[PDB]
Design an enzyme around this catalytic site. Structure first.
Site, PDB file in Angstrom:
ATOM      1  N   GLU A  23       0.846  -1.194   0.000  1.00 25.43           N
ATOM      2  CA  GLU A  23       0.000   0.000   0.000  1.00 25.43           C
ATOM      3  C   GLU A  23       0.881   1.243   0.000  1.00 25.43           C
ATOM      4  N   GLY A  24       0.447   2.269  -0.731  1.00 28.22           N
ATOM      5  CA  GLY A  24       0.902   3.631  -0.517  1.00 28.22           C
ATOM      6  C   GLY A  24       0.019   4.115   0.612  1.00 28.22           C
ATOM      7  N   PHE A  26      -2.098   6.947  -0.422  1.00 23.28           N
ATOM      8  CA  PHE A  26      -3.167   7.262  -1.382  1.00 23.28           C
ATOM      9  C   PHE A  26      -3.855   5.975  -1.848  1.00 23.28           C
ATOM     10  N   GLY A  27      -3.058   4.944  -2.132  1.00 22.53           N
ATOM     11  CA  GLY A  27      -3.618   3.694  -2.609  1.00 22.53           C
ATOM     12  C   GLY A  27      -2.907   2.411  -2.232  1.00 22.53           C
ATOM     13  CE  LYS A  51      -1.573   4.379  -6.666  1.00 17.96           C
ATOM     14  NZ  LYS A  51      -1.403   4.566  -5.198  1.00 17.96           N
ATOM     15  CD  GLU A  99       4.907  -2.794 -19.526  1.00 17.24           C
ATOM     16  OE1 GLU A  99       5.651  -1.960 -18.940  1.00 17.24           O
ATOM     17  OE2 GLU A  99       5.122  -3.212 -20.715  1.00 17.24           O
ATOM     18  CB  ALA A 101       8.122  -5.056 -12.198  1.00 13.21           C
ATOM     19  CG  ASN A 105      12.845  -1.918  -4.736  1.00 18.10           C
ATOM     20  OD1 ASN A 105      14.030  -2.198  -4.566  1.00 18.10           O
ATOM     21  ND2 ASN A 105      12.015  -1.778  -3.768  1.00 18.10           N
ATOM     22  CG  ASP A 148      11.823   9.994  -5.163  1.00 11.99           C
ATOM     23  OD1 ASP A 148      13.026  10.003  -4.835  1.00 11.99           O
ATOM     24  OD2 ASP A 148      10.962   9.354  -4.527  1.00 11.99           O
ATOM     25  NE  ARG A 152      13.104   6.451  -2.863  1.00 10.68           N
ATOM     26  CZ  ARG A 152      14.291   7.000  -2.631  1.00 10.68           C
ATOM     27  NH1 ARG A 152      15.261   6.287  -2.081  1.00 10.68           N
ATOM     28  NH2 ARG A 152      14.540   8.261  -2.990  1.00 10.68           N
ATOM     29  CG  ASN A 153      10.777   5.583  -7.014  1.00 13.66           C
ATOM     30  OD1 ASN A 153       9.952   4.902  -6.441  1.00 13.66           O
ATOM     31  ND2 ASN A 153      11.225   6.736  -6.527  1.00 13.66           N
ATOM     32  CG  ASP A 166       6.264   5.442  -8.025  1.00 19.35           C
ATOM     33  OD1 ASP A 166       5.288   4.839  -8.512  1.00 19.35           O
ATOM     34  OD2 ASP A 166       6.707   5.188  -6.862  1.00 19.35           O
TER      35      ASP A 166
HETATM   36  S1  LIG Z   1      -0.038   5.461  -4.794  1.00 17.61           S
HETATM   37  O1  LIG Z   1      -0.181   5.853  -3.418  1.00 17.61           O
HETATM   38  O2  LIG Z   1       0.101   6.622  -5.635  1.00 17.61           O
HETATM   39  C1  LIG Z   1       1.309   4.375  -4.977  1.00 17.61           C
HETATM   40  C2  LIG Z   1       2.407   4.681  -5.786  1.00 17.61           C
HETATM   41  C3  LIG Z   1       3.460   3.766  -5.893  1.00 17.61           C
HETATM   42  C4  LIG Z   1       3.409   2.555  -5.192  1.00 17.61           C
HETATM   43  C5  LIG Z   1       2.302   2.260  -4.387  1.00 17.61           C
HETATM   44  C6  LIG Z   1       2.220   0.974  -3.628  1.00 17.61           C
HETATM   45  O3  LIG Z   1       1.226   0.728  -2.935  1.00 17.61           O
HETATM   46  O4  LIG Z   1       3.293   0.003  -3.722  1.00 17.61           O
HETATM   47  C7  LIG Z   1       3.246  -1.218  -2.996  1.00 17.61           C
HETATM   48  C8  LIG Z   1       4.338  -2.153  -3.484  1.00 17.61           C
HETATM   49  O5  LIG Z   1       3.995  -2.612  -4.801  1.00 17.61           O
HETATM   50  C9  LIG Z   1       5.127  -2.445  -5.657  1.00 17.61           C
HETATM   51  N1  LIG Z   1       4.684  -2.156  -7.034  1.00 17.61           N
HETATM   52  C10 LIG Z   1       4.068  -1.036  -7.476  1.00 17.61           C
HETATM   53  N2  LIG Z   1       3.853  -1.171  -8.802  1.00 17.61           N
HETATM   54  C11 LIG Z   1       4.339  -2.378  -9.177  1.00 17.61           C
HETATM   55  C12 LIG Z   1       4.407  -3.046 -10.390  1.00 17.61           C
HETATM   56  N3  LIG Z   1       3.936  -2.383 -11.569  1.00 17.61           N
HETATM   57  N4  LIG Z   1       4.909  -4.302 -10.443  1.00 17.61           N
HETATM   58  C13 LIG Z   1       5.356  -4.905  -9.327  1.00 17.61           C
HETATM   59  N5  LIG Z   1       5.329  -4.271  -8.144  1.00 17.61           N
HETATM   60  C14 LIG Z   1       4.836  -3.008  -8.052  1.00 17.61           C
HETATM   61  C15 LIG Z   1       5.952  -1.324  -5.048  1.00 17.61           C
HETATM   62  O6  LIG Z   1       7.337  -1.449  -5.388  1.00 17.61           O
HETATM   63  C16 LIG Z   1       5.708  -1.473  -3.566  1.00 17.61           C
HETATM   64  O7  LIG Z   1       6.678  -2.385  -3.021  1.00 17.61           O
HETATM   65  C17 LIG Z   1       1.255   3.171  -4.282  1.00 17.61           C
END
Ligand SMILES: *S(=O)(=O)c1cccc(C(=O)OC[C@H]2O[C@@H](n3cnc4c(N)ncnc43)[C@H](O)[C@@H]2O)c1
Length: 289
Positions: A23-24, A26-27, A51, A99, A101, A105, A148, A152-153, A166
């Site tokens: 989780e972020g 926001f989401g 998301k 997509e 991944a 990270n 950023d 990690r991104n 991101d």
């Molecule tokens: S939101 O609040 O705008 C937002 C933005 C970026 C990441 C997150 C989040 O909840 O990340 C949780 C966790 O999931 C991984 N993550 C995110 N996107 C992917 C994809 N496309 N593939 C595999 N893993 C993903 C992040 O690295 C994080 O560890 C919320």
């Protein structure tokens, strides 16, 4: 309600929601299976990340998620970024589908492959940098400033493709809290160019500074920059012109690259177009043995 966009709309019933990836605030991001994402293959499932807005989420949170999605639509597709694949916008909560991944990270990916199940040659490490520079050169070519950029991104696919993530996030810069840490316990100010940190001025040249820190993270296999340094001491280091020492197992030529990324004068840093070409030649000359 949200406007309908048939370039991107996927019917809700074509998405099978799976387990949370985290989780972020926001989401929340979930793994899912999308059925018949391509128009030619309606009977094929594709793993994807999805998301969506957490429970007690505001109008501001919504508009921020929408901005991110709209930005990814304008930016277009590239091998080295996380691409938009569809959206569920109608008759229920917003889902943005991107997509997936599988290998997490780049920081995790790299730490998991340190000497003590898999290891990385010098060619692999340089290739990793070349891919991130490529994604960055594309993003820059579409006028996007990440703000950023950090290991990690960057996400890594099952085929070991590096993807910038991101890059479309909403910022509302100068509201950034310099003291707040990542879940890993690190401080994002440690990737920021001095002009972006002191004067809040962001440019491609500042993303280049961040890419230097990223190179250093890659060659230390996921090390932590300035460990033990709090924010105020970091500020003093930057004012004094301090530059991080060269990692062991990094060539002089790659360290010179980092240092050129960290030019005190923004105009004199290399561009991503230049970094791509240099890394291209270096990959070709770097041993896989
Ligand atoms: S939101 O609040 O705008 C937002 C933005 C970026 C990441 C997150 C989040 O909840 O990340 C949780 C966790 O999931 C991984 N993550 C995110 N996107 C992917 C994809 N496309 N593939 C595999 N893993 C993903 C992040 O690295 C994080 O560890 C919320």
């Amino acid at each position: 309600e949200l406007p309908e966009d048939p370039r991107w709309e996927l019917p809700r019933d074509r998405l099978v929601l799976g387990k949370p990836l985290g989780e972020g605030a926001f989401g929340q991001v979930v793994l899912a299976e999308a059925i018949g994402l391509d128009k030619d293959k309606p009977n094929r499932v594709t793993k994807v990340a999805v998301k969506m807005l957490k429970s007690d989420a505001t109008e501001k949170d919504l508009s921020d998620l929408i901005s991110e999605m709209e930005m990814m639509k304008m930016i277009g597709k590239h091998k080295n970024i996380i691409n938009l694949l569809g959206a569920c916008t109608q008759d229920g909560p917003l889902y943005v589908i991107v997509e997936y991944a599988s290998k997490g990270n780049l920081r995790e990916y790299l730490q998991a492959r340190r000497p003590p199940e898999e290891q990385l040659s010098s060619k692999d490490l340089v290739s990793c940098a070349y891919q991130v520079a490529r994604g960055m050169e594309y993003l820059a070519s579409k006028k996007c400033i990440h703000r950023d950029l950090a290991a990690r991104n960057v996400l890594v696919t099952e085929d070991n493709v590096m993807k910038i993530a991101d890059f479309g996030l909403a910022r509302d810069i100068h509201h950034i809290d310099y003291y707040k840490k990542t879940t890993n316990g690190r401080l994002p100010v440690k990737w920021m160019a001095p002009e972006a940190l002191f004067d809040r001025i962001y440019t491609h040249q500042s993303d280049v500074w961040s890419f230097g820190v990223l190179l250093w993270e890659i060659f230390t296999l996921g090390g932590s920059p300035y460990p033990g340094v709090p924010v105020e001491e970091l500020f003093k280091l930057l004012k004094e012109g301090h530059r991080m020492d060269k990692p062991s197992n990094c060539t002089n030529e790659l360290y010179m690259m980092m240092r050129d990324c960290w030019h005190a004068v923004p105009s004199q840093r290399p561009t991503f177009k230049q970094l791509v070409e240099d890394l291209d030649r270096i990959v070709a000359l770097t041993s896989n043995q």
